[PDB]
């Protein structure tokens, strides 16, 4: 009996593409999805296959360092017995010279480009040789696939649809940008594969990386860190209406999410672009105007199980391709379970912010993060609001209970200490108390500006920024900022007031503490001693006063107001004394009333009771 000769193999692009939902990708080469049977037809030259005489065996390899242990290589015979969940081949039709075969991949097979080989054996003789190539993708249709999605219309939207909306604008003026993901355009699937093949984990361990491509968690994680360019390229580096041009040129803000979504839909992971809106003198705003806060922010959600985590975390996972991040279940964000991988705290901070006033302790609602979180409706041209998936309603026991799981008691006040006087330099303090068992690391803005009696803010006369302020558990701190006469004199108002403001930022949980306090730089005190009455005043300035003059009156003590000038200028710190004669009109209590006048220091007042 002569050995078999394959004339050709028919990859059945059409019936395969339609059944595997890869029609658009099956224009040239074969593309299929895991955990689902596909078809090949062998045409032999001469006699057909005879199960009794011929044993046929298949071999598939994927990647640059295949192995069986890693799941990136399989050998499997052509037989009637089909083992569920394994690589198998089985005859399903036999005609004149053709042999119809049905192949199955495991639902957890690594995705990627596969070389398919066939060894034809007639016991006493044999011959191996390559049939061709197919690409294996994730299968949201396969009940046993991690990325399974029980709903047909959701499968259409989150994998199959090539145009969507990305939401921009603002929480109150939501704008929907139409986008062309075009995950099934020419060359796109090949680029997604290349992208995978140049990610750092591939350069580090090609074999292991190709194996780990069985995981939608691994694959989504890798994609989040490849859209952006961190000196290693890297698709994007920080107008156009789709992902295709960007990706094609590559091979040679919302854009990151858009490209990520293109790639992940292409690889077969159901995915959606989501937008989060944030909204806003105030130290916070000042501080902003390296993670800041923007009017909106875009990331993606992918759908998968999470066997790598504890049970119950399957479903939507957040991934942020914004300048590796994720995947992290969306329910873990909503639940304040930030210990959950990957990168919980980072996503939590995109949708939470805890802002507290110490204006002396109240809730400051001048910053509001996490509003109208949005994504396109399934199979309709309208916006779905998914804020609820990230956040329990404000003020609920679930919202509060969740805040605790996340946060696992810190307070701030402005302190002065000793007395402050018009003309002197002196410290002000941000006094921070930490009666928790937690250790913190915060940013601190401490700054002062003059303010009128009416509340109008003059120019800055002191600033201290601290990028990393360490707060030990059960401890406190007095952080000094030194206010200089040299720096406030020129910019002082009729008010005589300085406004101290502090901002403490705890970046991880995204907490903010504001303390604010106005301080009054008091005028010198006029000393009035009765011997005749003597009145003196100490120059409080480091400068000399020119044209000093007193004025004294007090009915029951003088029938004449006595305005005496001071000839010489009074030097810094140098006191100035005058005296005038008094002839007590009547008997009881009288009040002497004094005014001091000067070029720099004007309108200072005093009095003394007598008898």
């Amino acid at each position: 009996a002569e050995e078999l000769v394959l004339e050709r193999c028919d990859l059945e692009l059409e019936t395969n593409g339609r059944d595997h939902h890869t029609a658009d990708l099956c224009r040239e080469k074969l593309v299929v999805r895991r955990g689902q049977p596909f078809w090949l037809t062998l045409h032999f030259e001469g006699r057909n296959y005879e199960a009794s005489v011929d044993s046929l065996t298949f071999s598939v390899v994927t990647g640059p360092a295949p192995s069986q242990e890693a799941g990136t290589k399989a050998r499997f015979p052509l037989r009637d017995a089909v083992e569920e969940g394994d690589w198998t081949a089985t005859v399903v039709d036999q005609q004149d010279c053709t042999l119809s075969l049905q192949l199955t991949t495991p639902a957890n097979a690594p995705i990627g480009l596969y070389r398919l080989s066939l060894e034809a054996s007639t016991g006493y003789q044999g011959s191996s040789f390559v049939l061709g190539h197919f690409i294996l993708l994730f299968n949201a249709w396969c009940p046993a696939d991690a990325v399974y999605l029980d709903s047909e219309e959701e499968r259409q939207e989150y994998v199959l649809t090539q145009q969507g909306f990305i939401y921009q604008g603002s929480a109150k003026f939501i704008k929907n940008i139409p986008w062309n993901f075009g995950q099934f355009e020419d060359g796109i699937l090949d680029i997604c594969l290349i992208l995978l093949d140049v990610n750092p984990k591939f350069l580090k361990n090609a074999g292991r990386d190709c194996s780990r491509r069985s995981s939608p968690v691994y694959v989504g994680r890798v994609v989040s860190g490849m859209v952006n360019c961190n000196d290693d390229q890297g698709v994007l580096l920080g107008s156009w209406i789709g992902s295709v041009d960007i990706l094609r040129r590559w091979k040679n803000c919302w854009v990151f999410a858009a490209v990520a979504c293109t790639v992940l839909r292409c690889l077969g992971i159901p995915t959606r672009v989501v937008t989060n809106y944030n909204s806003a003198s105030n130290l916070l705003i000042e501080y902003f105007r390296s993670e800041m806060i923007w009017n909106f922010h875009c990331w993606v959600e992918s759908w998968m199980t999470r066997p790598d985590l504890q049970p119950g975390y399957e479903g939507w996972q957040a991934l942020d391709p914004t300048p590796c991040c994720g995947p992290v279940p969306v329910r873990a964000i909503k639940e304040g379970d930030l210990s959950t991988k990957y990168d919980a705290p980072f996503v939590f901070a995109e949708v939470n912010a805890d802002v507290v006033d110490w204006i002396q302790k109240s809730i400051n609602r001048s910053l509001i993060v996490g509003l109208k979180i949005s994504t396109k409706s399934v199979g309709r041209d309208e916006r779905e609001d998914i804020t609820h998936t990230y956040k329990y309603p404000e003020g609920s026991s679930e919202e509060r209970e969740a805040f605790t799981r996340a946060n696992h008691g810190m307070a701030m006040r402005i302190r002065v200490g000793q007395s402050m006087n018009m003309g002197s330099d002196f410290d002000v303090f941000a006094h921070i108390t930490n009666n928790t068992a937690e250790e913190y690391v915060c940013r601190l803005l401490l700054c002062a500006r003059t303010v009128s009696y009416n509340g109008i803010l003059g120019p800055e006369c002191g600033t201290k920024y601290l990028l990393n302020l360490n707060l030990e558990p059960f401890s406190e701190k007095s952080v000094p900022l030194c206010i200089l006469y040299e720096k406030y004199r020129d910019c002082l108002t009729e008010s005589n007031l300085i406004k101290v403001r502090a901002l403490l930022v705890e970046p991880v949980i995204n907490s903010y503490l504001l303390a604010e306090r106005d301080l009054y730089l008091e005028n010198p005190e006029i000393k009035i001693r009765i011997l005749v009455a003597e009145v003196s005043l100490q120059n409080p300035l480091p400068v000399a006063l020119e044209g000093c003059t007193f004025t004294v009156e007090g009915a029951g003590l003088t029938e004449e107001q006595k305005t005496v000038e001071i000839p010489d200028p009074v030097e810094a710190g140098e006191e100035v004394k005058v005296r005038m004669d008094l002839l007590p009109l009547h008997m009881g209590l009288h009040k002497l009333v004094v005014n001091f006048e000067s070029d720099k220091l004007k309108a200072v007042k005093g009095f003394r009771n007598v008898i």
């Binding site: 902003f288 923007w294 922010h297």
Partner: peptide
């Protein structure tokens, strides 16, 4: 996209 704009800083708050």
């Amino acid at each position: 996209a704009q800083p708050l």
